[PDB]
Curated annotation (Swiss-Prot):
UniProt source species: Homo sapiens
Positions of disulphide bridges: C5-C55, C14-C38, C30-C51
Stated name of the protein: Collagen alpha-3(VI) chain
Localization terms from the record: Secreted, Extracellular space, Extracellular matrix
Whole-protein coverage range: 3108 to 3165 of 3177
Site, as annotated: Reactive bond: R15, D16
Length: 58
């Protein structure tokens, strides 16, 4: 709980769909997806390494 790592990939139904990295609890690493600035959640990074620094692979 209060564990962002449990929140799913965010393609935030808006108008700026840019590609970002999200953390996958199944692997515990990150993949590349299409996020949007206004109608989303926060499991969205700029590079796998950022992700690795926010949730990480354990």
């Amino acid at each position: 709980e209060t564990d962002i790592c449990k929140l799913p990939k965010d393609e935030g139904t808006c108008r700026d769909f840019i590609l970002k990295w999200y953390y996958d609890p199944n692997t515990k690493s990150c993949a590349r997806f299409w996020y949007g600035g206004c109608g989303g959640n926060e499991n969205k990074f700029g590079s796998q390494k950022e992700c690795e620094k926010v949730c990480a692979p354990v």
